[PDB]
DNA sequence: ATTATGACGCT
DNA sequence: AGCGTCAT
């Protein structure tokens, strides 16, 4: 009862850019704005593979992973922007630089955890305590939450999307106890006011729109963020969780989309996240291991303790390229040439990283995939990264992988390589 | 020929 | 250290 801690200590937000690479290209090229648009990598094979899709194009059924030729079948007026190519491969530098723009704005409001190229978590607990101090018990006006949805509201006792949003927000605000600076619902509401400000700052200073989730932990904030995309933010309160999870497919929760979520569904004979509540912590640990079991036991009650890590920069810097089918590398000259191309891109990114961020990588991880292997990596080998020199890095990568060539002939490579991947890791402050 | 990465758990 | 999982 009273000692039953409900994981409402923290205010956590997740901010995720809407169709991010598309917005980067639309900012650069106004002709693409407010159009069905997608971003593609490469062109020759089936028109290139789509990795980002404007919401106008999603209305026609265009999705990531679709070949552009097929997307064009669904949406003949679809506009396409191609990722830059450098040294024979896709080069994502434009999107990484845009990402840095956004992350630097978010960092003004709180310490962030960079979780991908286009999203970050924010622990707003302290900023909320400050804004509550300033408010002096003053209520929160709906005018301060102009793009906020309250998940699960309105309820009970209407035809337009914005009208529904405002109805739900009024029900939420009317029920708020603003004299209690420790009410979790009030704390989430103040967090949402701050996130409105953060999102306004991002759009004003970059031209990019984003969505956001506000809840008591990272998993709920991420899920909330997705609920009302694009260009809106969603507050998922602790109290909204039973209804939200009652019909929430297990796979929708981050980390349960793969084999583990399939095993939850199959072993327990359930479909929805809320059904997990009927099992004891020990039962879940017995099926899914001690860590997963404890995580599931708390998560189906809306509780998760994973902290917002103070980390604005990526932990690794890596370069990869596939060589599918008849393009797989089957000679020693080919392997050396592409290792050098990857290594030159890596050198460039690493030198820029060192100048910006006062750190140096110390370990180089070489990953390859060999033909006829379905796994992502067929083999991973690490070596020391002592100089930011592409020729040295590619020579060392070759040295650590060259024992994989089963060809007796010196010139040929067998079986051919369908993937090369260089990753710089283990950063030290320089 | 669902590509380019990046985080993280496991042993 | 090297592999597997989840991601998108
Ligand atoms: N190279 C590469 N980039 C990718 C891939 N998948 C995504 N990206 C890039 C392109 C994406 O723009 C970006 C961010 O990924 P999201 O947040 O998952 N999708 P978005 O922001 O587009 O739309 P939404 O409004 O639904 O959040 O990552 C991929 O498989 N490969
Ligand atoms: Mn996004
Ligand atoms: Mn994202």
């Amino acid at each position: 009862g009273p000692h039953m801690a409900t994981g409402q200590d923290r205010v956590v937000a997740l901010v995720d850019m809407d169709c991010f690479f598309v917005q980067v290209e639309q900012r650069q090229n106004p002709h693409l704005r407010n159009k069905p648009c997608a971003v593609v990598q490469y062109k020759s094979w089936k028109g290139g593979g789509i990795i980002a899709v404007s919401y106008e194009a999603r209305a026609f059924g265009v999705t990531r992973s679709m070949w552009a030729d097929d997307a064009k079948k669904l949406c003949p007026d679809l506009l396409l922007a191609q990722v830059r190519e450098s040294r024979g491969k896709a080069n994502l530098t434009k999107y990484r630089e845009a990402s840095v723009e956004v992350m630097e704005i978010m960092s003004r409001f709180a310490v962030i955890e960079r979780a991908s190229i286009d999203e970050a978590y924010v622990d707003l607990t302290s900023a909320v305590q400050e804004r509550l101090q300033k408010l002096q018990g003053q209520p929160i006006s709906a005018d301060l939450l102009p793009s906020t949805y309250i998940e699960g509201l309105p309820q009970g006792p209407t035809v337009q999307k914005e009208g529904m949003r405002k109805q739900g927000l009024f029900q939420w605000l009317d029920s708020l106890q603003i004299d209690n600076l420790t009410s979790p619902d009030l704390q989430l509401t103040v967090g949402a006011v701050i996130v409105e400000e953060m999102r306004a700052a991002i759009e004003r200073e970059t031209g990019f729109q984003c969505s956001a989730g506000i809840s008591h932990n990272k998993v709920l904030a991420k899920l909330a963020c997705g609920l009302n995309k694009p260009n809106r933010q969603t507050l998922v309160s602790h109290g909204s969780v039973p209804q939200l999870f009652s019909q929430m497919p297990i796979r929708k929760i981050r980390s349960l989309g793969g084999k583990l979520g399939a095993s939850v569904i199959e072993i327990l004979g359930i479909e929805y996240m809320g059904e997990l509540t009927q099992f004891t912590e020990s039962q879940l640990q017995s099926h899914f291991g001690e860590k997963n079991g404890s995580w599931l036991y708390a998560m189906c009650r809306g509780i998760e303790h994973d902290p917002v890590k103070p980390r604005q920069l990526p932990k690794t810097i890596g370069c990869s390229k596939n060589f599918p089918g008849k393009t797989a590398l089957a000679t020693r000259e080919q392997v050396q040439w592409w290792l050098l191309q990857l290594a030159q891109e890596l050198e460039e990114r690493l030198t820029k990283d060192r100048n910006d961020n006062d750190r140096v990588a110390t370990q180089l991880v070489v990953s390859i995939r060999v033909q006829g292997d379905k796994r992502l990596s067929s083999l991973r080998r690490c070596c020391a990264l002592t100089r930011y020199d592409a020729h040295k890095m590619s020579h060392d990568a070759f040295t650590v992988i060259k024992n994989c060539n089963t060809s007796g002939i010196q010139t040929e490579w067998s079986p051919p390589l369908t993937m090369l991947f260089l990753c710089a890791t283990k950063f030290s402050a320089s």
Side-chain angles (χ1 to χ4, degrees), chain A residues 231-247:
Chain A
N231 197 29
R232 299 290 188 252
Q233 54 183 64
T234 304
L235 187 161
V236 162
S237 62
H238 183 76
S240 77
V241 172
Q243 288 198 234
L244 179 65
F245 279 6
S246 74
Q247 296 191 89

Side-chain angles (χ1 to χ4, degrees), chain A residues 23-303:
Chain A
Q23 286 200 87
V24 175
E25 299 294 336
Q26 296 178 312
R27 182 176 72 171
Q28 186 184 319
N29 181 354
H31 277 320
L32 306 180
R33 300 178 178 182
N34 308 123
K35 288 302 172 323
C37 183
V39 168
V40 286
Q41 330 178 95
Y42 307 119
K43 205 72 191 93
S44 289
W45 192 273
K46 300 209 168 107
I50 292 176
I51 54 171
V53 186
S54 82
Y55 282 78
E56 295 86 338
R58 299 184 191 195
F60 292 87
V62 182
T63 68
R64 91 168 264 284
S65 308
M66 204 173 260
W67 298 114
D69 287 351
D70 299 322
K72 276 289 199 180
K73 307 172 179 165
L74 298 176
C75 178
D77 294 321
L78 178 70
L79 301 180
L80 301 175
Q82 318 182 240
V83 170
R84 186 177 344 161
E85 161 281 305
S86 299
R87 309 175 187 283
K89 66 178 292 296
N91 190 295
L92 308 175
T93 296
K94 187 196 302 184
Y95 315 104
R96 288 190 188 99
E97 295 180 347
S99 178
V100 170
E101 290 182 67
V102 170
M103 303 286 168
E104 293 189 333
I105 296 163
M106 294 182 58
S107 296
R108 299 208 307 257
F109 294 80
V111 152
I112 72 173
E113 177 180 347
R114 180 197 197 270
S116 83
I117 197 165
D118 90 323
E119 77 212 75
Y121 295 89
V122 205
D123 191 315
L124 294 168
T125 308
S126 56
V128 160
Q129 296 291 329
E130 306 208 354
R131 284 296 279 290
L132 273 168
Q133 292 231 46
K134 271 192 288 181
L135 280 187
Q136 301 262 352
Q138 173 169 9
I140 314 198
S141 158
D143 287 336
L144 298 183
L145 293 162
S147 64
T148 295
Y149 279 83
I150 310 297
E151 173 59 27
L153 298 181
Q155 93 158 348
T158 58
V159 173
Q160 52 168 249
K161 260 86 100 190
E162 173 66 8
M164 293 288 288
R165 184 197 77 81
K166 288 191 145 163
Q167 272 192 293
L169 180 57
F170 303 138
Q171 293 190 355
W172 172 258
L173 293 172
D174 272 47
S175 313
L176 266 192
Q177 64 178 334
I178 47 71
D179 50 335
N180 182 10
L181 284 227
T182 68
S183 172
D185 290 347
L186 178 58
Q187 289 168 344
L188 288 186
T189 305
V190 171
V193 173
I194 291 168
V195 174
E196 292 275 11
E197 291 158 7
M198 301 182 61
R199 293 180 47 250
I202 292 170
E203 183 175 10
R204 180 186 89 78
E205 300 178 29
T206 71
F208 302 145
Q209 292 184 347
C210 58
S211 297
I214 305 97
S215 191
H216 289 298
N217 53 63
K218 293 207 294 185
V219 168
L220 288 184
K222 174 64 180 180
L223 183 174
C225 180
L227 291 180
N228 288 107
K229 271 199 182 254
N231 197 29
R232 299 290 188 252
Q233 54 183 64
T234 304
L235 187 161
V236 162
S237 62
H238 183 76
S240 77
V241 172
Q243 288 198 234
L244 179 65
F245 279 6
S246 74
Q247 296 191 89
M248 185 59 69
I250 282 153
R251 67 178 179 276
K252 302 294 208 193
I253 272 55
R254 189 160 262 272
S255 82
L256 301 183
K259 268 150 154 243
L260 173 64
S263 76
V264 174
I265 289 165
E266 167 178 78
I267 290 179
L268 300 182
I270 63 173
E271 301 190 14
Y272 305 118
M273 199 54 196
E275 294 178 83
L276 280 163
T277 62
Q278 69 198 307
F279 303 95
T280 70
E281 192 171 3
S282 298
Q283 290 175 312
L284 295 176
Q285 292 175 320
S286 186
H287 293 295
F288 310 113
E290 162 197 9
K291 172 134 162 260
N292 287 335
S294 287
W295 183 86
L296 289 163
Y297 180 85
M299 186 70 260
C300 70
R301 298 165 166 75
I303 297 171

